Amino acid sequence: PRVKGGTVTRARRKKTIKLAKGYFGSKHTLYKVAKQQVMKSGQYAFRDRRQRKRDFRKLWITRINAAARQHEMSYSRLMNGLKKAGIDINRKMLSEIAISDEKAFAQLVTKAKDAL
Amino acid sequence: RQTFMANESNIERKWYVIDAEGQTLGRLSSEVASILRGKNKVTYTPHVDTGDYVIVINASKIEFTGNKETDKVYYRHSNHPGGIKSITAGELRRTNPERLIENSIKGMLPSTRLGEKQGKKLFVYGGAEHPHAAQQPENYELR
Amino acid sequence: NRSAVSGGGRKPWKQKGTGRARQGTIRAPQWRGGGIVFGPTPRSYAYKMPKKMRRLALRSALSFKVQENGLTVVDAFNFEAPKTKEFKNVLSTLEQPKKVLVVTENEDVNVELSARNIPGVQVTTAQGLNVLDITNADSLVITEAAAKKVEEVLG
Amino acid sequence: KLHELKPAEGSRKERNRVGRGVATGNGKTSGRGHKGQKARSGGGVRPGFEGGQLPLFRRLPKRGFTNINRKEYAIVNLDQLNKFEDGTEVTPALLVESGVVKNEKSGIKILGNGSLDKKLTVKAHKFSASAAEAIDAKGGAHEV
RNA sequence: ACCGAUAGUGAACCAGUACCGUGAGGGAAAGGUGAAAAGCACCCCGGAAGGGGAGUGAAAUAGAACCUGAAACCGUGUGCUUACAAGUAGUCAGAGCCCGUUAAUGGGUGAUGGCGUGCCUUUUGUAGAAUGAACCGGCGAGUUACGAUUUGAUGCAAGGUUAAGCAGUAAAUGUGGAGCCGUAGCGAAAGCGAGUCUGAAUAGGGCGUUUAGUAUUUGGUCGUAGACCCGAAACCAGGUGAU
RNA sequence: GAGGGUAGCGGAGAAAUUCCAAUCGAACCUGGAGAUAGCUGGUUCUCUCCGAAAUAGCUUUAGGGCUAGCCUCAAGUGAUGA
RNA sequence: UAACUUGGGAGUCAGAACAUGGGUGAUAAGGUCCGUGUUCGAAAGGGAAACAGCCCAGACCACCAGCUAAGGUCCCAAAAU
RNA sequence: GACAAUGGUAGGAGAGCGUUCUAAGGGCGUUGAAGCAUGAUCGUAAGGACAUGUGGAGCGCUUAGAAGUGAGAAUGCCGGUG
């Protein structure tokens, strides 16, 4: 029996064009150009997903350092003091309390200095 | 996902004034640049401008170190064949004390769209009097 | 194939001198209207199996038929004229399903002329029992003489 | 039933098709390699050898000849004769019928491998030295 | 358990026709209204083609360039955004503005920040300024026959098994025991035989004493046939040409 | 100018490898024929486990082969491996 | 925690840089030929501005969680003016 | 439950998706099949459903069998359009 093509090639190419909605120029129209951009998009997302965690950790440290400078002490000196007392509070919770309750963060700063 | 972000509707900007009497050119510029970028604020946002305005008085009477009076040269090109110009740091300080301070500070800021705007909040004056009295500038003590 | 299609002896153009793909014939597979490479070819699909294994393939089918209570024995068919209605009635009396296979000791002309227009009804002889027919049929009706002949001739 | 057919387990396997994409494992080169004589359509070298150094069957000499008048005998051992009951006659006309000799090439030869433990009479074309005494040890006789 | 208009004969249509060549010779593209022509009487714009009504028809965007009607490509209107900016055009984070779904920790757009030099082939090594593709659609490459070996399944078992032919529906089944493999090897051979050859001498040594195979079939590989596909410069034979 | 002759293993050449239908170190058409190509190019669906080599010998051999080394699957022996 | 034997199927025979012992060259070459290791080939991630072979380290998938290696803590740019 | 493993070119092994036809069984369809367009849906992948528009007559589902069975590259062939 002769197996002729039809309704299989077209249904598979239109899925790639749908995934490329919103691209510039021919990158959302032509299958060959749009197919290459989808592979690049998938590779970028895998890399950016793991890189996203480093960027947000560096943002918390920057905000913690700025808030600590107002108490005449540094970031590298503050974090050493907390671990002596065993505070065990990460950067994410340290940053949120340093902008919501500025009085609450002052209590932690005093405790770190007491432990030297 | 509970990280706070700052936008144009909840940002307060202030004005500060700094005097450049007897300060090293690069050491004064290093601390000033961190104020324009808002790095000293706790609500710092890398994609939003959160800095403060800076006024620098006494552009002249700024001190160098070593032999930088005649051994520090600034070059530039006019995009023409063979056209290159130069000037020393000592000559630039007394012919144009304002441009000397601006270039050193502006070279410490990122060269992006937001960085090109954060450098527009710096004001440099050769004398000791500034015309921005309608604002509320406060004296700033260097760290 | 390439040689069977009519025409395509010359070369369409010279090997080099112009900017075009090199071609030898107009009937090559990549062309439109050229020969087909590795298509279907006339052959046969039949094959054989050892004789001892064919006997087991029929006894197993008969045993599977008899386990499910699908084998009934009747007397001779003394039909005098070919009548489809009479065969329909005798099937209804025996309470047989829509698919049924009936065997005869020899070729019964009167039985074969009837029952050959009723859907789901087929007739075979005692000697010519098939493997497909036994599996396909829903019920089996056999005469005692044909049953004895099957028991004797078949192992 | 014709609508539930199950072949014997472990008796059917799907074939392998090459040149059908890279995820299969045999996509581009179809298991051939890169840029060789064996990577072209038309085969490689002869099963023996092609070119190169001298083949093995060329550096060795021929040995022997063959005999036109060669005779081959169908061999029947003593243990194979235990089927026949004791005190009976055995003939090449009977060994073939009984299923012991399928093809009588030039004759029947009795070889003494095993144990007889019988009292039968057998005639054949040739006998071995060992099979001669074993037949006559417990009684009986052999005729050529 | 053959094709269904790029397929099947080159030719489903008045095809060896158009057309190309002095000649021998080469050689296409083109199928479809509707059940029924019932193929738009009549009115309006022109010189006409065409269009808007009315009417026939279940349907006229089924109106004869007529069944459905994808993509490339070309035009109209709209929600968000853009004229200080250095871009493999995306991805992650993200205010502002406009909507409301197969109702789910929803959709469209995008002021700004971080990271980021296409795909395939061939190479020690390619963003490479090494090759290939203008774009979209269709077609386009490990197959079959006969033998060998190996693995799995199944029937019988010191036995296993048919070939041609005859009967039977071109039918899967009976008959057909010529034939083939195995049950015993060694030696160039005569020949001997669980033992044979070499040898003066089982003295030693080599190869045997496993002494369970055989018929069919799925899969892997090889051989003979063009043997995964496309591509020569050339050779031979028979003819056509001094417009 | 008109009517004619010489045909490819051949013709014609005041001789240049010049001409024989825009092509000639051997014309054009059809067949052997799907010639041969150790050479370039191409070879179409998706997942899971394991995972090299660019070395020695020989070669009318050097960008090609064969045997050995190194990889994978199945069945076996059982401390023989570092 | 692997080695050995018998069977089915392959690919490979153009290698490169770095450290070390040599020949050759000129105690020249990103030169060429040998011995001994690592990496690339067939390896993404971090550092060396960018930079296959150098240093650290071997990605089953998801998280806006913690401690470390090579290299670093004035601003670009996270961390000691 | 407890532990251990899961980067990969040439290449070896295994389990699977989808298309066309056939046998048997069982279904859908003018109260609307295939095909075509859209959608914010489902599975680890190739892929599978549902609703709405057009369309006007055929088509799926389960177990088996067979193969002209899967396209982005060959200065590929044919048609259309920049």
mmCIF file of C-alpha atoms (C1' of nucleotides) in Angstrom, chain E:
data_model
loop_
_atom_site.group_PDB
_atom_site.id
_atom_site.type_symbol
_atom_site.label_atom_id
_atom_site.label_comp_id
_atom_site.label_asym_id
_atom_site.label_seq_id
_atom_site.Cartn_x
_atom_site.Cartn_y
_atom_site.Cartn_z
ATOM 1 C "C1'" A E 1 -4.252 -6.703 2.547
ATOM 2 C "C1'" C E 2 -2.361 -2.839 -6.269
ATOM 3 C "C1'" C E 3 -2.525 3.682 -7.846
ATOM 4 C "C1'" G E 4 -6.198 7.441 -7.016
ATOM 5 C "C1'" A E 5 -4.624 13.201 -10.978
ATOM 6 C "C1'" U E 6 3.449 15.715 -8.915
ATOM 7 C "C1'" A E 7 0.464 8.940 -8.135
ATOM 8 C "C1'" G E 8 -1.105 5.015 -12.105
ATOM 9 C "C1'" U E 9 1.054 3.687 -19.076
ATOM 10 C "C1'" G E 10 4.603 9.403 -21.744
ATOM 11 C "C1'" A E 11 -0.833 9.968 -22.548
ATOM 12 C "C1'" A E 12 -8.195 9.560 -17.205
ATOM 13 C "C1'" C E 13 -8.742 15.730 -21.597
ATOM 14 C "C1'" C E 14 -9.400 13.969 -29.805
ATOM 15 C "C1'" A E 15 -1.244 12.710 -26.786
ATOM 16 C "C1'" G E 16 3.084 10.505 -29.670
ATOM 17 C "C1'" U E 17 -0.736 15.964 -30.026
ATOM 18 C "C1'" A E 18 1.808 21.142 -28.638
ATOM 19 C "C1'" C E 19 6.548 22.399 -29.158
ATOM 20 C "C1'" C E 20 12.014 22.020 -30.382
ATOM 21 C "C1'" G E 21 15.750 19.982 -34.672
ATOM 22 C "C1'" U E 22 18.043 19.919 -41.859
ATOM 23 C "C1'" G E 23 17.603 14.909 -40.259
ATOM 24 C "C1'" A E 24 17.680 10.307 -37.491
ATOM 25 C "C1'" G E 25 15.346 11.774 -32.900
ATOM 26 C "C1'" G E 26 13.352 14.131 -28.204
ATOM 27 C "C1'" G E 27 8.569 15.113 -25.726
ATOM 28 C "C1'" A E 28 4.701 18.097 -22.252
ATOM 29 C "C1'" A E 29 0.880 20.830 -19.007
ATOM 30 C "C1'" A E 30 -4.558 20.481 -18.528
ATOM 31 C "C1'" G E 31 -10.188 15.927 -14.196
ATOM 32 C "C1'" G E 32 -14.743 17.788 -10.444
ATOM 33 C "C1'" U E 33 -21.430 23.553 -10.500
ATOM 34 C "C1'" G E 34 -25.982 21.359 -8.889
ATOM 35 C "C1'" A E 35 -30.303 15.771 -7.656
ATOM 36 C "C1'" A E 36 -32.395 18.221 -11.769
ATOM 37 C "C1'" A E 37 -29.783 23.907 -16.563
ATOM 38 C "C1'" A E 38 -34.120 24.725 -13.428
ATOM 39 C "C1'" G E 39 -27.379 28.781 -16.652
ATOM 40 C "C1'" C E 40 -30.084 34.974 -13.232
ATOM 41 C "C1'" A E 41 -37.100 37.392 -16.519
ATOM 42 C "C1'" C E 42 -37.037 42.391 -14.934
ATOM 43 C "C1'" C E 43 -34.757 47.565 -12.542
ATOM 44 C "C1'" C E 44 -30.115 51.009 -11.933
ATOM 45 C "C1'" C E 45 -24.380 53.081 -13.325
ATOM 46 C "C1'" G E 46 -21.300 52.194 -19.340
ATOM 47 C "C1'" G E 47 -19.354 52.706 -25.058
ATOM 48 C "C1'" A E 48 -18.382 47.801 -22.977
ATOM 49 C "C1'" A E 49 -16.174 44.484 -19.024
ATOM 50 C "C1'" G E 50 -17.988 44.595 -14.096
ATOM 51 C "C1'" G E 51 -21.149 45.588 -9.982
ATOM 52 C "C1'" G E 52 -25.905 46.480 -6.637
ATOM 53 C "C1'" G E 53 -31.167 44.664 -6.278
ATOM 54 C "C1'" A E 54 -35.109 41.116 -7.766
ATOM 55 C "C1'" G E 55 -35.814 35.869 -9.203
ATOM 56 C "C1'" U E 56 -34.319 29.924 -9.650
ATOM 57 C "C1'" G E 57 -32.224 26.735 -6.077
ATOM 58 C "C1'" A E 58 -31.392 23.495 0.665
ATOM 59 C "C1'" A E 59 -27.177 26.517 -0.153
ATOM 60 C "C1'" A E 60 -25.201 31.801 -5.764
ATOM 61 C "C1'" U E 61 -18.416 33.668 -1.266
ATOM 62 C "C1'" A E 62 -22.314 26.423 -5.600
ATOM 63 C "C1'" G E 63 -22.580 32.039 -11.355
ATOM 64 C "C1'" A E 64 -19.640 27.907 -15.949
ATOM 65 C "C1'" A E 65 -11.401 31.283 -14.324
ATOM 66 C "C1'" C E 66 -17.702 27.295 -10.721
ATOM 67 C "C1'" C E 67 -16.894 20.801 -4.568
ATOM 68 C "C1'" U E 68 -13.567 21.883 0.199
ATOM 69 C "C1'" G E 69 -9.798 26.030 0.113
ATOM 70 C "C1'" A E 70 -3.382 25.610 3.956
ATOM 71 C "C1'" A E 71 1.330 28.585 3.372
ATOM 72 C "C1'" A E 72 4.515 32.062 1.120
ATOM 73 C "C1'" C E 73 2.981 37.118 -0.452
ATOM 74 C "C1'" C E 74 -0.162 41.792 -1.055
ATOM 75 C "C1'" G E 75 -3.937 45.619 1.203
ATOM 76 C "C1'" U E 76 -7.945 48.238 5.238
ATOM 77 C "C1'" G E 77 -9.223 49.385 10.346
ATOM 78 C "C1'" U E 78 -8.128 48.994 15.433
ATOM 79 C "C1'" G E 79 -5.980 47.939 21.787
ATOM 80 C "C1'" C E 80 -0.527 48.762 23.831
ATOM 81 C "C1'" U E 81 4.294 50.993 22.410
ATOM 82 C "C1'" U E 82 8.288 53.999 19.845
ATOM 83 C "C1'" A E 83 12.152 60.302 17.141
ATOM 84 C "C1'" C E 84 19.722 60.729 22.736
ATOM 85 C "C1'" A E 85 19.705 55.538 20.501
ATOM 86 C "C1'" A E 86 25.275 50.800 19.343
ATOM 87 C "C1'" G E 87 20.716 45.594 18.550
ATOM 88 C "C1'" U E 88 22.111 36.758 16.102
ATOM 89 C "C1'" A E 89 16.721 40.277 17.904
ATOM 90 C "C1'" G E 90 15.925 36.000 22.438
ATOM 91 C "C1'" U E 91 15.688 34.628 27.807
ATOM 92 C "C1'" C E 92 15.291 35.937 33.191
ATOM 93 C "C1'" A E 93 13.375 40.246 36.479
ATOM 94 C "C1'" G E 94 9.825 44.058 35.994
ATOM 95 C "C1'" A E 95 6.221 49.184 36.904
ATOM 96 C "C1'" G E 96 2.494 51.335 33.781
ATOM 97 C "C1'" C E 97 -2.006 50.683 30.194
ATOM 98 C "C1'" C E 98 -6.079 47.545 27.739
ATOM 99 C "C1'" C E 99 -9.217 42.902 28.292
ATOM 100 C "C1'" G E 100 -11.788 38.495 30.541
ATOM 101 C "C1'" U E 101 -10.546 32.052 29.767
ATOM 102 C "C1'" U E 102 -11.079 24.824 28.224
ATOM 103 C "C1'" A E 103 -11.457 29.356 35.424
ATOM 104 C "C1'" A E 104 -6.088 28.888 36.224
ATOM 105 C "C1'" U E 105 -1.498 31.021 42.145
ATOM 106 C "C1'" G E 106 -5.506 34.259 33.800
ATOM 107 C "C1'" G E 107 -4.625 36.938 28.487
ATOM 108 C "C1'" G E 108 -2.410 41.288 25.156
ATOM 109 C "C1'" U E 109 1.515 45.086 25.163
ATOM 110 C "C1'" G E 110 6.221 46.513 27.005
ATOM 111 C "C1'" A E 111 9.650 52.286 30.410
ATOM 112 C "C1'" U E 112 14.017 49.886 32.354
ATOM 113 C "C1'" G E 113 18.233 46.040 34.532
ATOM 114 C "C1'" G E 114 21.341 41.113 33.903
ATOM 115 C "C1'" C E 115 23.092 37.195 30.427
ATOM 116 C "C1'" G E 116 23.722 36.130 25.411
ATOM 117 C "C1'" U E 117 28.584 36.179 18.230
ATOM 118 C "C1'" G E 118 22.213 31.429 13.463
ATOM 119 C "C1'" C E 119 21.569 26.067 11.464
ATOM 120 C "C1'" C E 120 23.894 21.922 8.762
ATOM 121 C "C1'" U E 121 28.522 19.561 6.651
ATOM 122 C "C1'" U E 122 33.723 18.798 7.107
ATOM 123 C "C1'" U E 123 37.658 19.243 10.617
ATOM 124 C "C1'" U E 124 43.188 18.911 15.727
ATOM 125 C "C1'" G E 125 40.449 23.216 15.893
ATOM 126 C "C1'" U E 126 34.662 27.207 12.730
ATOM 127 C "C1'" A E 127 30.768 33.518 14.866
ATOM 128 C "C1'" G E 128 33.994 32.335 11.093
ATOM 129 C "C1'" A E 129 36.039 36.082 5.976
ATOM 130 C "C1'" A E 130 35.661 27.264 4.609
ATOM 131 C "C1'" U E 131 30.534 24.660 1.984
ATOM 132 C "C1'" G E 132 24.958 24.727 1.381
ATOM 133 C "C1'" A E 133 19.940 27.029 1.452
ATOM 134 C "C1'" A E 134 15.553 33.622 -1.439
ATOM 135 C "C1'" C E 135 10.803 32.004 0.764
ATOM 136 C "C1'" C E 136 6.336 28.553 1.108
ATOM 137 C "C1'" G E 137 3.857 23.772 -0.586
ATOM 138 C "C1'" G E 138 4.216 18.677 -2.834
ATOM 139 C "C1'" C E 139 7.711 14.505 -4.405
ATOM 140 C "C1'" G E 140 12.680 12.728 -3.019
ATOM 141 C "C1'" A E 141 17.527 7.460 -0.328
ATOM 142 C "C1'" G E 142 19.377 -0.129 3.494
ATOM 143 C "C1'" U E 143 14.320 -3.070 -0.290
ATOM 144 C "C1'" U E 144 13.207 -8.102 -2.548
ATOM 145 C "C1'" A E 145 14.579 -13.236 -4.359
ATOM 146 C "C1'" C E 146 17.842 -17.433 -3.448
ATOM 147 C "C1'" G E 147 21.851 -19.651 -0.056
ATOM 148 C "C1'" A E 148 25.245 -19.480 4.868
ATOM 149 C "C1'" U E 149 25.764 -18.540 10.152
ATOM 150 C "C1'" U E 150 23.951 -16.925 14.986
ATOM 151 C "C1'" U E 151 20.044 -15.694 18.641
ATOM 152 C "C1'" G E 152 14.547 -16.432 20.425
ATOM 153 C "C1'" A E 153 9.779 -19.392 19.878
ATOM 154 C "C1'" U E 154 7.369 -23.836 18.801
ATOM 155 C "C1'" G E 155 6.478 -29.703 17.309
ATOM 156 C "C1'" C E 156 8.928 -34.464 17.605
ATOM 157 C "C1'" A E 157 13.125 -37.007 19.637
ATOM 158 C "C1'" A E 158 18.065 -41.573 18.141
ATOM 159 C "C1'" G E 159 15.503 -39.973 15.294
ATOM 160 C "C1'" G E 160 13.678 -35.371 12.298
ATOM 161 C "C1'" U E 161 11.759 -34.094 7.529
ATOM 162 C "C1'" U E 162 9.860 -33.176 2.834
ATOM 163 C "C1'" A E 163 10.833 -32.023 -3.123
ATOM 164 C "C1'" A E 164 8.578 -32.349 -8.126
ATOM 165 C "C1'" G E 165 3.785 -34.547 -9.289
ATOM 166 C "C1'" C E 166 -1.980 -35.924 -8.300
ATOM 167 C "C1'" A E 167 -6.689 -34.330 -6.047
ATOM 168 C "C1'" G E 168 -8.828 -29.727 -4.012
ATOM 169 C "C1'" U E 169 -11.989 -22.917 -4.792
ATOM 170 C "C1'" A E 170 -5.359 -19.528 -8.113
ATOM 171 C "C1'" A E 171 -8.106 -22.245 -2.104
ATOM 172 C "C1'" A E 172 -3.849 -24.928 2.975
ATOM 173 C "C1'" U E 173 -4.486 -30.562 3.461
ATOM 174 C "C1'" G E 174 -4.590 -35.449 2.017
ATOM 175 C "C1'" U E 175 -1.270 -38.402 -0.776
ATOM 176 C "C1'" G E 176 3.720 -38.599 -2.522
ATOM 177 C "C1'" G E 177 10.034 -41.596 1.325
ATOM 178 C "C1'" A E 178 13.765 -40.044 -5.046
ATOM 179 C "C1'" G E 179 16.253 -37.172 -1.596
ATOM 180 C "C1'" C E 180 18.768 -34.376 2.909
ATOM 181 C "C1'" C E 181 20.706 -33.840 8.143
ATOM 182 C "C1'" G E 182 22.125 -36.584 12.656
ATOM 183 C "C1'" U E 183 23.356 -41.227 15.397
ATOM 184 C "C1'" A E 184 31.675 -42.614 14.706
ATOM 185 C "C1'" G E 185 35.927 -41.154 13.839
ATOM 186 C "C1'" C E 186 41.237 -41.416 11.709
ATOM 187 C "C1'" G E 187 44.292 -41.560 7.413
ATOM 188 C "C1'" A E 188 46.864 -38.430 0.866
ATOM 189 C "C1'" A E 189 44.971 -43.439 -0.088
ATOM 190 C "C1'" A E 190 44.458 -48.882 0.180
ATOM 191 C "C1'" G E 191 42.143 -49.560 4.847
ATOM 192 C "C1'" C E 192 41.053 -49.943 10.169
ATOM 193 C "C1'" G E 193 37.371 -48.784 13.610
ATOM 194 C "C1'" A E 194 36.114 -46.379 19.890
ATOM 195 C "C1'" G E 195 40.020 -46.153 18.354
ATOM 196 C "C1'" U E 196 43.053 -44.290 13.851
ATOM 197 C "C1'" C E 197 47.689 -41.830 11.590
ATOM 198 C "C1'" U E 198 52.992 -41.184 12.002
ATOM 199 C "C1'" G E 199 56.417 -44.463 13.496
ATOM 200 C "C1'" A E 200 60.924 -50.632 13.765
ATOM 201 C "C1'" A E 201 57.981 -49.941 18.486
ATOM 202 C "C1'" U E 202 50.449 -46.029 22.254
ATOM 203 C "C1'" A E 203 57.232 -45.512 23.139
ATOM 204 C "C1'" G E 204 55.733 -40.525 22.502
ATOM 205 C "C1'" G E 205 52.768 -37.098 19.838
ATOM 206 C "C1'" G E 206 48.313 -35.105 16.517
ATOM 207 C "C1'" C E 207 43.087 -35.527 15.760
ATOM 208 C "C1'" G E 208 38.503 -38.517 18.002
ATOM 209 C "C1'" U E 209 35.512 -41.337 22.276
ATOM 210 C "C1'" U E 210 30.550 -34.292 23.832
ATOM 211 C "C1'" U E 211 29.282 -39.937 21.312
ATOM 212 C "C1'" A E 212 21.094 -34.508 20.888
ATOM 213 C "C1'" G E 213 19.704 -33.550 17.017
ATOM 214 C "C1'" U E 214 16.214 -32.127 13.286
ATOM 215 C "C1'" A E 215 11.747 -29.140 10.316
ATOM 216 C "C1'" U E 216 9.551 -24.120 10.203
ATOM 217 C "C1'" U E 217 9.588 -19.150 11.526
ATOM 218 C "C1'" U E 218 10.744 -13.415 14.144
ATOM 219 C "C1'" G E 219 15.431 -10.471 14.623
ATOM 220 C "C1'" G E 220 21.130 -9.444 13.533
ATOM 221 C "C1'" U E 221 25.186 -10.113 9.798
ATOM 222 C "C1'" C E 222 27.470 -12.047 5.066
ATOM 223 C "C1'" G E 223 27.457 -13.834 -0.360
ATOM 224 C "C1'" U E 224 25.257 -13.638 -5.595
ATOM 225 C "C1'" A E 225 21.935 -9.937 -8.221
ATOM 226 C "C1'" G E 226 22.643 -2.209 -9.858
ATOM 227 C "C1'" A E 227 21.949 -3.679 -3.632
ATOM 228 C "C1'" C E 228 21.440 3.286 0.527
ATOM 229 C "C1'" C E 229 20.671 7.485 -3.396
ATOM 230 C "C1'" C E 230 22.394 11.259 -6.936
ATOM 231 C "C1'" G E 231 27.265 12.714 -10.209
ATOM 232 C "C1'" A E 232 31.761 11.874 -14.751
ATOM 233 C "C1'" A E 233 36.311 12.691 -18.405
ATOM 234 C "C1'" A E 234 35.638 7.917 -21.544
ATOM 235 C "C1'" C E 235 34.641 2.723 -24.715
ATOM 236 C "C1'" C E 236 31.842 -0.456 -28.257
ATOM 237 C "C1'" A E 237 27.687 -1.403 -31.928
ATOM 238 C "C1'" G E 238 23.807 0.254 -35.414
ATOM 239 C "C1'" G E 239 22.180 4.640 -37.968
ATOM 240 C "C1'" U E 240 21.556 10.494 -39.544
ATOM 241 C "C1'" G E 241 24.080 14.653 -41.658
ATOM 242 C "C1'" A E 242 28.518 18.717 -47.363
ATOM 243 C "C1'" U E 243 21.038 23.718 -47.324
#
